[PDB]
Paper text:
GPR110, also known as ADGRF1, is an aGPCR that plays a key role in neurite growth and synaptogenesis in the cortical neurons. A general activation mechanism of aGPCR involves the removal of the GAIN domain through an autoproteolysis process which generates a short peptide called stalk peptide right before the transmembrane domain, then the stalk peptide inserts into the ligand binding pocket of the receptor and activates receptor in model called “self-activation by tethered agonist”. In this work, we report cryo-EM structures of GPR110 in complex with Gq, Gs, Gi, G12 and G13 and systematically compare all major G-protein couplings in one receptor which revealed undisclosed information of G-protein coupling.
Nb3522 is added in the mini-Gs and mini-Gq complex assembling, and scFv16 was added in the Gi, G12 and G13 complex assembling. The global resolutions for the Gq, Gs, Gi, G12 and G13 complex are 2.85 Å, 2.84 Å, 3.09 Å, 2.8 Å and 2.66 Å respectively based on the gold standard of Fourier Shell Correlation (FSC) = 0.143 criterion. In positon −5, all the 5 G-proteins have a polar residue. Based on the above observation, we classify G-protein engagements into 2 major classes, Class I, Gαq/Gαs engagement; Class II, Gαi/Gα12/Gα13. The Y at position −4 of Gαq and Gαs all point to the gap between TM3 and TM2, surrounding by R6232.46, L6823.54, L6813.53 and R6853.57. The tyrosine at −4 position and glutamate or asparagine at the −3 positon enable polar interaction with receptor, for instance N−3 of Gαq interact with D8428.47, and E−3 of Gαs interact with S8438.48. In this case, Gq and Gs both have tyrosine at position −4, while Gi/G12/G13 have a small hydrophobic residue, indicating Gq/Gs use a similar pattern to couple receptor while Gi/G12/G13 use a different tactic.
Author numbering:
A (entry chain D): 1 to 127
B (entry chain B): 3 to 340
C (entry chain A): 12 to 64, 204 to 253, 264 to 394
D (entry chain R): 567 to 772, 784 to 854
E (entry chain C): 8 to 63
Amino acid sequence: QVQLQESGGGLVQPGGSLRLSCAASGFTFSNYKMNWVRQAPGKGLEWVSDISQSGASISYTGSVKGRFTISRDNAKNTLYLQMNSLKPEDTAVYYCARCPAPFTRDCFDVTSTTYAYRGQGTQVTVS
Amino acid sequence: ELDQLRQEAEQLKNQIRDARKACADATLSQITNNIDPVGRIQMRTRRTLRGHLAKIYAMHWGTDSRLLVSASQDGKLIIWDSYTTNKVHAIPLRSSWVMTCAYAPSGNYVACGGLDNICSIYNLKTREGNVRVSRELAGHTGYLSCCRFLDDNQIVTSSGDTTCALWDIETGQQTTTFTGHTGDVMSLSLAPDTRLFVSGACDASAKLWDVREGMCRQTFTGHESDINAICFFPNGNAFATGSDDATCRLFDLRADQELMTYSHDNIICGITSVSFSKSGRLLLAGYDDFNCNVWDALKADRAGVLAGHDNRVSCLGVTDDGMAVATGSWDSFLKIWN
Amino acid sequence: LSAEDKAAVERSKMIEKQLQKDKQVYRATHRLLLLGADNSGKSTIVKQMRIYHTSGIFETKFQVDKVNFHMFDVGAQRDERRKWIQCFNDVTAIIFVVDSSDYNRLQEALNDFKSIWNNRWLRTISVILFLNKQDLLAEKVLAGKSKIEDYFPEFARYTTPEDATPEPGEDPRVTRAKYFIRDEFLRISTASGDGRHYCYPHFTCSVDTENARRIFNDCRDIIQRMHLRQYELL
Amino acid sequence: TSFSILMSPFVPSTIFPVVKWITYVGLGISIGSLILCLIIEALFWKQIKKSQTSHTRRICMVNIALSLLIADVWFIVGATVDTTVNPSGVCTAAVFFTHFFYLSLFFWMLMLGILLAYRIILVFHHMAQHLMMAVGFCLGYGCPLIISVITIAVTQPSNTYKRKDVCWLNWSNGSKPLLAFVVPALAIVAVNFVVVLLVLTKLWRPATIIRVGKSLLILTPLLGLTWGFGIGTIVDSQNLAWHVIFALLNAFQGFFILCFGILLDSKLRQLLFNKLS
Amino acid sequence: SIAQARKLVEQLKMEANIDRIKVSKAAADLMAYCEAHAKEDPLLTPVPASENPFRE
């Protein structure tokens, strides 16, 4: 029974900061790659940031490359994301995402309409 | 609103967990501490069956324990006599991509399906010497994965559109549709008396059904990734599953929770086929490793290995009298062990 | 041996005699897979290639210089593709068509390309990459309503490679834009490979006729590589 | 007993002690090496039969090695036979056998060359396994028999098939049987040369130098481009090295095949080390 | 959604009121079944070659 629960939303002025935290339960946490996804009000499912099994490979989408920072903590079973100078185009709903298989580098089916390993999400509003 | 419904669902799940904890007063590995180990099991090939040009992706036995059926991805369906290594029938298909096959217990029909979302049924006992197509069943919305006969007039199918179906052949339409999974369904196993059956999905879930009423009764969880194979214990009171996380497990339909987990530390690849034996004291499993492993079921230790395949193992089967084991693989060969 | 055994052996020999004819026809044909997105022009190249001639899968047959090619396009399926993609591990190649005139979706296409490159059962399969719709890119760049550097910052520090051949006689901005995306794809192509498969980029539009000859010429190159590696020379 | 007499009508006596020992040691390692080769070819047979091309390749290699070993042992036998006493007997048989077997070696190498070209020049073309087996064995062990029997039949009556000092072919102003070795041998290496150039125009497409070198250091032993240095032994006496580079290049054929053509393979080495461990 | 949560609640209602038994009673049945049919399993107790169809 895979559980992924998010926390750390709210309302923030333009230029503000806040911290997202995902807690996991129901698997060996250190074998699996992790992701971040968001759903903007009026669009489909996008892709934001990535991290590897150990903590030494990192990758970003184009528009968050100077502002947001990703990290993981294998001891406390938590995934992080920090944001620094927010623009109004970041208001969304935010989910963490796992990978279907252990011990692999390919990442299938993270942005699909239905997918089993994906949290409920948290709302972030900037204005 | 939805908040109240979700809170009620969380409360229901908490009550279910609390009721499942207090039913486990013992662990199987403690009651089975004094059981004698079965020893070392060594097996060796007796027949090698050649004739296919591509991968072999499914196989099935017949009620008479002498005849076989095999399916490949070049467009062929072959019926074998395993005693003398003859060929009785070779049937061409219309779509190359095939993923399942089966005999009927009456020894008169075969069936198949695949990526194209149809189930085809073939008659074996025509007056002439040519086999033709008797019926085509359409109405799914995703690739079929498994199919098993019940009588000569009733079949059960599973598809990648998250649904199971029961089909009547002469009329040609569904009588019951089973809905409730969230992902694709992968494997099935009918009961010895043919009144219930089990299904596992590409989530970490499995269920039990009722063919007459048409409803779910029990759901089992515990794995971490997709579930690839499933089968029944002989008495109909257990079932063993394997998943794409290098793990097998055993489940019961009254305690409603796990009883054994088979895994190791050097095994970091998944499981493709699972098959029991006549008494229940052996559990045979296939891997992309590329081997087959023989697990003692009552103590969770390896008691034997089967090697000789140059590529991934996809299928596996035992007979209704207990005399042989048949294994196929992505290297276009079937092998018989005794 | 009684009469029954004789008859059984006669029938088995008569069956082998037909399987031997089936082998040749199976081995004289080549199989290809076609992939893309809903806004990619996938069907237009199929219609163009058919000149050379409900349902879960389609099929198209074409023939170049007395060589028979089969092409397969998937339909009537869901959006999850990690179980039926395992069936295509013995094809000669995979064809990948991408729309290069919509800047809002190219990141999704790159992420879709990486998962195909690094999958376990597709590490011996090569890819032919089509960068469709180069006509629209010309007007979208010249007009000046959208800024390419707003979706990709690194474009601010890019110079045209000296091996480029702007033959048509175009505005250099078009050439910078054209080659930037191909570099973006070839980075992923080159990084994690191991010398066991390759990648072939091309520039297409909706009015080209030469899309069969290119597949022919690339399949020759693929097969020559396989033959040389089987002798331990590459 | 200089190893140059295969190509040489005449061996000047000056360097006579220089080359001799080399032969008696060279062939030595060769013999040993080839035995080991066949041992490996016997240990991992069921694990190499994957496809058509690899199967035909392995067949050609084992045939080459076998022919070379037997030709070497017959040269050794026929070089230590005293002809000062018995003017007949073993000094015909040995000669004949050596001849036959060496020719077979050469023809087998030709096959390998052709196979490479057929995998490159004609890319979309397919044939049956057994027809290829038939042509390979009928032109591998087929022409050696014809040439050997024609030469011996047309030469033995007048006693012009054997030298007056050693057990090998001769020529002196009359019958010249030695050409029935040189003409069919040399004009196989002047074909395999071409093949090599072809493969080099397919590996220099763009690190490149190491690739080209490792390619060119595998195909020199098997296709036998070194024997071409016999083209100077037939047309000269001593000048610098012709009689001495010949021996040290061509007598260690088995050593080179065991070092580069087998142990430098990727799959075979891994299987060998896994079985050993 | 509302309908999905309603269906989940309804199904969990049936799934949460079913009879159960303890595990030490559902291990002994599996344990005894094997001993009941242990002399007729060929792949545990091999047979003489005179009755083996795949070897004779």
